[PDB]
Write a protein that binds this ligand. Structure first.
Ligand SMILES: N#Cc1c(Cl)ncnc1Nc1ccc2c(c1)CC(=O)N2
Ligand SMILES: N#Cc1c(Cl)ncnc1Nc1ccc2c(c1)CC(=O)N2
Ligand SMILES: [Cl-]
Ligand SMILES: [Cl-]
Ligand SMILES: [Cl-]
Ligand SMILES: [Cl-]
Lengths: 4, 124, 124, 4
């Protein structure tokens, strides 16, 4: 999971 | 927005769509390319091809279970492009590049047409 | 094999599948969550959820046009997860995390359940 | 395009  | 994103999600969806195709699960159209037939999902075809997007948004053609491609279309070229649609992987070879490029032009798959032009230009 | 790969292909397919959903194009099921209804593509639902994969591979349920979820399922939680399925983006907030986690558990979306557990543990 |  990432900060897009 | 303040969303988080799962990097592999799009790739995992496509992998499962290909698994469904391989098992003939909820496939809703057969693409006929001369003597050959290819089962697929209309939504995946539309999402990958300008030609299929046009065909399946047509008020009559959206309901067809069989689509017959132009007799000039090469079945192997179509097969390579159908695999690309479901995998992101293009089996581009010296022996198939002309057929793949012609099929991608017909199907309106601009990025494929682009790499075919580039690979051809490099060999001249 | 000796394939080349188009990095953005999977993401572009998913973007187009979401565009089709927004325009209600070739959607083939309505998911009922108490008073709310959500139109979708069975193949995308199956590709994202263990529960939908089970339901639509069932010889009778594969043919249903309406699926009614358990009355305990929160519509907003379902909406957030349906958006995630079609975009890879999860709108996870303090006010919705419990509903999102419970809905992801029911839908069998392991990666979502995982980030919800991690975000909850960080706040305790 | 890349070599996967
Ligand atoms: N399905 C869908 C779809 C939608 Cl909803 N919006 C916009 N394009 C869509 N698909 C589509 C249209 C044109 C082309 C491609 C895909 C690849 C390409 O080279 N040309
Ligand atoms: N459609 C399809 C499908 C296929 Cl074909 N093969 C395998 N899994 C499939 N989908 C599916 C099954 C279980 C889970 C998910 C998706 C996400 C998750 O957390 N659990
Ligand atoms: Cl027909
Ligand atoms: Cl393309
Ligand atoms: Cl029904
Ligand atoms: Cl997930």
């Amino acid at each position: 999971w990432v900060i897009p | 927005d303040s969303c988080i994103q799962f990097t592999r999600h799009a790739s995992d969806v496509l992998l499962n769509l290909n698994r469904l195709r391989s098992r003939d699960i909820l496939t809703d159209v057969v693409i006929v390319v001369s003597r050959e037939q290819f089962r697929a999902h209309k939504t995946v075809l539309m999402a990958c091809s300008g030609l299929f997007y046009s065909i399946f948004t047509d008020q009559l053609k959206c309901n067809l279970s069989v689509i017959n491609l132009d007799p000039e279309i090469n079945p192997e070229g179509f097969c390579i492009l159908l695999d690309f649609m479901y995998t992101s992987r293009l089996n581009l070879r010296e022996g198939n590049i002309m057929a793949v490029m012609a099929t991608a032009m017909y199907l309106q798959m601009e990025h494929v047409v682009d790499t075919c032009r580039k690979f051809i230009k490099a060999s001249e």
